[PDB]
Amino acid sequence: NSAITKANGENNAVVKINKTLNIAEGITTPTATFTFKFTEKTGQSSNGAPYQTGVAIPDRNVEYNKNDHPTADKIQKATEDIFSGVAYGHAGEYVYDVAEAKTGWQAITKNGKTIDAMRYDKRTYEMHVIVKNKVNGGVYISSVYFKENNKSNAPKVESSEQGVYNLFDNTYTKDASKEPNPDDPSQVDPNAKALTITKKVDGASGDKTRDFQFHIKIQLPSTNKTAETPVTNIIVKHGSKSEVLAVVTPADTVEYNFTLKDGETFTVEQLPAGSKYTVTETGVAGYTDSSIYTTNGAEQTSQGQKNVDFTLTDILIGEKKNDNKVTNKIDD
Template structure:
């Protein structure tokens, strides 16, 4: 009985091992049905494009830039042990793809990036036989863009994406639609230690679009000297100054009897630009430096003809300014918001608030004037007026009472 059981167990084990070896021998192409894989419809070529994501803050003109992606064939073995197919000039070679930006590519309000794509990367690519083709996809570094720089000082910067990806292209033989081959599926994996997950497409449809490379464009505020310059990001035209101030907030006191030594109190709060990676900025009142943490209300005091000056602020920053009301004074502001001149009036003796002002690439300044009306001499002490009225009423009453007594 035991021998029979052991015999059956051995037989079953051999069968299981044989089955596994058979399944391992079946060509498979790494989880083709995953939702991260671009799949063809029928036996037509799947279409895939790569998105370039350019992070940029508001108040900045999109730079002149051209980003280039390369597709380098990679050697290795498929998961069924078969070597990757060899790429030649006539079989599977993919030319570099470029994405270009200019000032006409405007950032949509409320967005923090501009996205453009390569178009179908397999357009004009020929495959002569079936198999798995693998490429390393990367972006050329520090290529296709020029900083706006004078001397050793630049007013802008570009952070390139140095990630790379394995792109797996599965090519199959046509069976039902004639001879030849077609691109059946494509998927991407980021090249990092231990990475196994595929990159999911940001958009599916006739073309699968993948957000693989994200660059960050940053610019210092207030450095474009001509607010009407139609090409503020052309590094060759020279209408910019690295030494221009990013923001100047000035206090002016107006009125013949106004106190020009009086300190006026402000609460100032900065909101960081969408591309900012620091936590604070620094301004100066005279020779005294003051640090402003993003999102934190900071109190400052300014008297007549005194200014808070910021040499450098990232373009795309916003600020809120609240002046505490002063008895008898009326505050108003004349300011530039990214080169546009604006005005705001206040109310006598009350707080004066300016909310969410943009600090852009063009001139930014703010002059807050506190006005005090002149005192008009009347020859009458207004402070004693109530007592004078009381005396007058008393005299009038005495006269009326005396007249009635005489008549009686």
């Protein structure tokens, strides 16, 4: 059974617990310590003897900081060998409830307002530690497996690799645009808007009273599904209008048409960092469109073609500044 970590001869089995932290793009890994607690459990082995007791396992922890970086929206970190410095005295089946504490992380806060959030795994496991006699005396850890608690006819948890078990899964989310100063993330602006798009008309012959047509699609990050508080609605503002737009599930997307004149701004009030947008301005006769935009604090540019729909695709909305100046240019 691949699910069981086994000993080589009379050498202790080596088991590690792996934490998965889900975290989207444009986000600095927070300071977080996740602690796993092992509580002795009474019951009855299949040989008829009670589960043995009286051997503690230390609390085990994994630490996250700004120098951990995600792959495919997750940071995996494993404890060391959980039986490090643990000695059993006599053979039998030792069982523990393994749970994750809700400790070791604090929200970034400014003017009494939090800008981030941590969803803690509520799953618990039964760890079975099968201790056996060495032929010459003393004991050893022969085999270890895990079953999830409060699950009908629970199967044994498969290891991710030799001795490493992915038991605990946590999700970090963070607001867009609240860390505007790239030299100092401590200078938090709690009133910052998630995204602004401003229209400029450039040219003595440019029509500064007409409407230019826009379509925006917002993709909320994969971490929204597992967030402490998933986002289900966003608020958009243009001219005098303010609208509450529903998030379409399961895609986790919002599509919206709006107009801008010269000087006008479209605003998304609040979004999770790691959100992405695609914005299309409709071609108008005479006009060549262009963009100067800040994507998670990075300044970029894009150049349109004359009288053709101008598209920016999969633009990251990060923790740092997010904005977009679209310029419509016409020759005299």
